[PDB]
Paper text:
Cryptophyte algae have a unique phycobiliprotein light-harvesting antenna that fills a spectral gap in chlorophyll absorption from photosystems. We propose that the macromolecular organization of the cryptophyte antenna consists of bulk open and open-braced forms that transfer excitations to photosystems via this bridging closed form phycobiliprotein.
Four new structures of [name] were determined (resolutions: 1.57 Å, 1.67 Å, 1.73 Å and 1.95 Å). The largest peak of [name] (555 A) is by far the most abundant PBP constituting approximately 63% of the overall protein complement (with other [name] spectrotype peaks contributing 8%). The filaments are generated via knobs-into-holes packing but differ in the distances between adjacent molecules along the filament (having either tight or loose interfaces). The bulk antenna proteins, [name] and HaPE560, are densely packed to form a concentrated glass of proteins as evidenced by electron micrographs and FRAP experiments.
Author numbering:
A (entry chain D): 5 to 177
B (entry chain J), D (entry chain A): 1 to 64
C (entry chain B): 1 to 177
Write the structure that this text describes.
């Protein structure tokens, strides 16, 4: 899928059939891996909104004047960024590596946030809730909704996706 | 480099082993029911959701 | 009644039409409680997915035979078709509330729908319960009786608009009974 | 008559009194922040949501 990342229109690429069978032989736990990716993207809205909501409820000064997500414009920008990050993490889990996340999402991002005054403590908490939420889904610890997968253990993939979130946290700290 | 264009990989996972097919959706070769699609899309601002989070952030949802 | 969007309903492609500014100010005079009415329509459409999914889920949890073999929403295809229909219906109700009448709902959504469902074996008891839950959910939003999400409106009374939208749901229920 | 084409009126309500404007989105006339948009679109099947309801219907949500 690398050409999707670098193409000018980002038009969709599709892999199925034998190409997808082959791809599932280069990464670990290919079927659980696709269920894990599916769990992230299928729930992207609620993951993002629960995570940004929690960063605010733990620090409501963030929606007061001078606050990081004061006004709808800034709240919407923050929700957008949380989704962007989440999606780069989903693509890292699909591909089994973080090179695109680091190159296209993280490189220069802390500098951008420092220039804008986007608060690092708030970003840290949004990322830690997104991580906890995704790991919760992948390990059957989500309480309202469960995944439609065969029952089993996905702890290795939870550790792997946790590491991708940790790369975000580390870069933005 | 982060390009400041809001574009992120949009991944979509398909499992159509139940045999339900939608017209015009075959986009790659394959007959076992599985497909992964990836596109690069600008992620949009959602004013309605921003309004809701501003109002409702202090409501615990989803048994958290 | 507000007729500005009539041409959207009848056009070949359904391309969007838009009204703002002084044109919209004048349009709102042709329906009661224009501002609260736009807020009510916004509450429906902004929450369309959760309204539909909570309503179909309740249908099923009260009558789980609906997802067993020979059931109305057995198989993902049937469940998806039912969630789609519930959204279609909710959207025609939202347009009824925007325009202050149910003529388009009756003509383009309900006229023929009972007979179609009879031909397909779509169970009336299940449709009745999805509709009554959607009605309760929408009324709950409009009357400050939603627990996980509150609206961002000025505080006040919207009981007349809740009664009006309840009537539009009742037309659906009556047509599909 | 119900035309069996899945097409339904999609109403969108805008309140941009906060002055936050997106490029390319002025489609009517006015500067007070308000707009109503209606289109007529085919409502699609959502396999992902159908899967979730089939799995999760027995869980009470939203304090219902
Ligand atoms: C995507 C929505 C969702 C469904 C559906 C589901 O079944 N679970 C879901 C989300 C989810 N959230 C968490 C964990 C946390 N959520 C929050 C924010 C809320 N807590 C607040 O105090 C607050 C303001 C009042 C909220 C809004 C937090 C803080 C967490 C914990 C994060 C942590 O560090 O552990 C999960 C993970 C499992 C769990 O229930 O804890 C999930 C799946
Ligand atoms: C859109 C989701 C939502 C948010 C967000 C919110 O704040 N309220 C929301 C939904 C909502 N639901 C209802 C009412 C009902 N929902 C159900 C379905 C669930 N009940 C079950 O037994 C079940 C299976 C286990 C469900 C799934 C039902 C039955 C109702 C009651 C319908 C009735 O006849 O009155 C409301 C209305 C307010 C309320 O709490 O009742 C709302 C706002
Ligand atoms: C943690 C992720 C989950 C968990 C996931 C499991 N999935 C298992 C088997 C499995 N999943 C799929 C579908 C998947 N593969 C694809 O190619 C695509 C679409 C591109 C998807 C959505 C398949 C085909 C399989 C193999 C079994 C089958 O044919 O259905 C699984 C069993 C162990 C294993 O096969 O590795 C598990 C445990 N299960 C959980 O309880 C957590 C929440
Ligand atoms: C600033 C970044 C805001 C934000 C604004 C957005 N509005 C979006 C779409 C949109 N807005 C209107 C109303 C506007 N157009 C008019 O003609 C009039 C009055 C005459 C007004 C008040 C319309 C009609 C539209 C749709 C345009 C169309 O149908 O082509 C929008 C795009 C969302 C998307 O692309 O998916 C944005 C980002 N959004 C935010 O979160 C901050 C608070
Ligand atoms: C039940 C529906 C709600 C409730 C709604 C109220 N809205 C009130 C006033 C109001 N709302 C708007 C925005 C609306 N008008 C438009 O044209 C559009 C977009 C096209 C929108 C989204 C305006 C401009 C106003 C009037 C200014 C004001 O009073 O703030 C309102 C006050 C009573 C009235 O004006 O008739 C209410 C009660 N309030 C509730 O508590 C439930 C949940
Ligand atoms: C039957 C009505 C089902 C239903 C199926 C749908 N699939 C939709 C989109 C879609 N499905 C695939 C996977 C398929 N195409 C392939 O090439 C391969 C393997 C080689 C398979 C397994 C793809 C790639 C797509 C997207 C096509 C595109 O990118 O243009 C779909 C449309 C969703 C929409 O219109 O928004 C449907 C309705 N959906 C259901 O709910 C029932 C159970
Ligand atoms: C949410 C958890 C945060 C929060 C986020 C904000 N980001 C704001 C502006 C902004 N964000 C980016 C990075 C974004 N663009 C990309 O292209 C990619 C990856 C490919 C990402 C992750 C940029 C470049 C910008 C400015 C330019 C733009 O929006 O196009 C923002 C507005 C800040 C301001 O204007 O002062 C916010 C509020 N803010 C918070 O407080 C929490 C911690
Ligand atoms: C959900 C609460 C129900 C349920 C709904 C089902 N409807 C099924 C097929 C279907 N629905 C319609 C009406 C729909 N199409 C429109 O154009 C309009 C309004 C403009 C509406 C409201 C049609 C025409 C059809 C058949 C053709 C099609 O889908 O394009 C359906 C599949 C039935 C089957 O194949 O056996 C279901 C499951 N089913 C339930 O059990 C609950 C009560």
């Amino acid at each position: 899928f690398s050409k999707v990342i670098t193409s000018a229109d980002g038009k969709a690429a599709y892999v199925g059939g034998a190409d997808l069978q082959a791809l599932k032989k280069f990464v670990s736990e290919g079927n659980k891996r696709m269920d894990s990716v599916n769990a992230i993207v299928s729930n992207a809205s609620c993951i993002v909104s629960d995570s940004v909501s929690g960063m605010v409820c733990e620090n409501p000064s963030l929606i007061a004047p001078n606050g990081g997500v004061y006004t709808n414009r800034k709240m919407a920008a923050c929700l957008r960024d949380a989704e962007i990050i989440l999606r780069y993490v989903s693509y890292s889990l699909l591909s089994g590596d973080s090179s695109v996340l680091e190159d296209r999402c993280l490189n220069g991002l802390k500098e951008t946030y420092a220039s804008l005054g986007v608060p690092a403590a708030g970003n840290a908490r949004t990322i830690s809730i997104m991580k906890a939420t995704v790991i919760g889904f992948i390990t059957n610890n989500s309480q309202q909704k469960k995944l439609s997968t065969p029952a089993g253990d996905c702890s290795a993939l939870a550790s792997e996706v946790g590491g991708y979130f940790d790369k975000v946290s580390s870069a933005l700290a | 480099a982060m390009k400041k264009d809001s574009k992120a990989p949009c991944v979509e996972v398909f499992d159509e082993r139940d045999g339900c097919k939608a017209a015009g959706t075959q986009k790659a070769s394959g007959d076992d029911g599985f497909c992964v699609k990836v596109s690069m899309k600008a992620i949009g601002f959602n004013a309605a959701e921003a309004a809701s989070v501003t109002k409702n952030y202090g409501i615990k949802r989803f048994g958290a």
